[PDB]
Design an enzyme around this catalytic site. Structure first.
Site, mmCIF file in Angstrom:
data_model
loop_
_atom_site.group_PDB
_atom_site.id
_atom_site.type_symbol
_atom_site.label_atom_id
_atom_site.label_comp_id
_atom_site.label_asym_id
_atom_site.label_seq_id
_atom_site.Cartn_x
_atom_site.Cartn_y
_atom_site.Cartn_z
ATOM 1 N N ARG A 143 41.287 45.671 51.339
ATOM 2 C CA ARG A 143 40.157 46.646 51.306
ATOM 3 C C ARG A 143 40.122 47.301 49.916
ATOM 4 N NH1 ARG A 143 43.921 49.017 54.821
ATOM 5 N NH2 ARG A 143 45.119 50.623 53.725
ATOM 6 N N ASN A 144 41.263 47.471 49.260
ATOM 7 C CA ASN A 144 41.322 48.159 47.941
ATOM 8 C C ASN A 144 41.378 47.160 46.781
ATOM 9 O OD1 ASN A 144 41.159 50.609 49.090
ATOM 10 N ND2 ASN A 144 43.406 50.906 49.227
#
Ligand SMILES: */C=C/C(=O)Nc1ccccn1
Length: 307
Positions: A143-144
């Site tokens: 996600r990052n």
């Protein structure tokens, strides 16, 4: 003495940039940036605080800004500057294909071995650079990581990043909303964080990509994770993964932090495998797979200011 941080923080006038549309709700816009007195247009993501009444929230976004100004690598997110309007605005390089977790969920059926292993190298390069800069990310996850192109990803979200002192081996935290299922054991038990705790989370990130965005320990609560890890249980071998790729993930999840690989070694091991991808990941149909004025538009990656 540690080395002085001579990163430049650039303050922009709100008149320098046009919000084109919303990407998220803090509210993120796609937009364009014209640097004052330069004939260039730079696709940007403009993150604007909502309430902007919260002294807490303003310390948060400026800490992000501090860290993102202090990093200059092709595999980490690129800050262009800030705007000190009522609502403080962060201006970054537009990453038009979004976060890599959404990208591999959306595109499972089109992603070949060459892309997956190159992503693994690029994130290893980003994380090795952070290590050179004595910076512990503390929140690496699929996600990052953001997608500039399917050929080119960059590590994002420096909201938890901590800048190890000259004599400080670990960083020591105390409370918050924390990503249990990505965290090293020493981090869940003793709030210890190092480059080696970042290697554990690189391991989980790799497992997310190799499973096309499956959820680690899905259906297992956060409370149980530390016990599972102490009992020696680890995430299962993904179907596409040769033992070569999986054994690398497994070494990242050793209980002895110093027994885990270094980011510089992960770069090397994933490069060796990236030279012959179909030897290391086995995917159904792999060979087949392919992934007003715009005149003065340039990507932020070709917009350099003097150093
Ligand atoms: C660090 C770059 C950045 O945040 N840009 C971004 C954010 C969300 C979508 C697209 N680009």
């Amino acid at each position: 003495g540690e080395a002085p941080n001579q990163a430049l923080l650039r303050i922009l006038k709100e008149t320098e940039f046009k919000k084109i549309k919303v990407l998220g709700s803090g509210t993120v816009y796609k937009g364009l940036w014209i640097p004052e007195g330069e004939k260039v247009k730079i696709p940007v993501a403009i993150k604007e605080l909502r309430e902007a009444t919260s002294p807490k929230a303003n310390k948060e976004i400026l800490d992000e800004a501090y860290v993102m100004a202090s990093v200059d690598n092709p595999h980490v997110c690129r800050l262009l500057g800030i705007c000190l309007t009522s609502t403080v605005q962060l201006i970054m390089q537009l990453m038009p294909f979004g976060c890599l977790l959404d990208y591999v969920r959306e595109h499972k059926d089109n992603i070949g071995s060459q892309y997956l292993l190159n992503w693994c190298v690029q994130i290893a390069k980003g994380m090795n650079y952070l290590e050179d800069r004595r910076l512990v990310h503390r929140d690496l996850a699929a996600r990052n990581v953001l997608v500039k192109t399917p050929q080119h990803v960059k590590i994002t979200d420096f909201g938890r990043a901590k800048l190890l002192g000259a004599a400080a081996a670990e960083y020591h935290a105390e409370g918050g909303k924390v990503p249990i299922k990505w965290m090293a054991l020493e981090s869940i038990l003793h709030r210890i964080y190092t480059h080696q705790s970042d290697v554990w989370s690189y391991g989980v990130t790799v497992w997310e990509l190799m499973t096309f965005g499956s959820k680690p320990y899905d259906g297992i609560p956060a409370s149980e994770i530390s016990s599972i890890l102490e009992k020696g249980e680890r995430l299962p071998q993904p179907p596409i993964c040769t033992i070569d790729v999986y054994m690398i993930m497994v070494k990242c999840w050793m209980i002895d932090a110093d027994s885990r690989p270094k980011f510089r070694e992960l770069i090397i091991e994933f490069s060796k495998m990236a030279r012959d991808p179909q030897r290391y990941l086995v995917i159904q149909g792999d060979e087949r797979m392919h992934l007003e004025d715009m005149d003065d538009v340039v990507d932020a990656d070709e917009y350099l200011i003097p150093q």
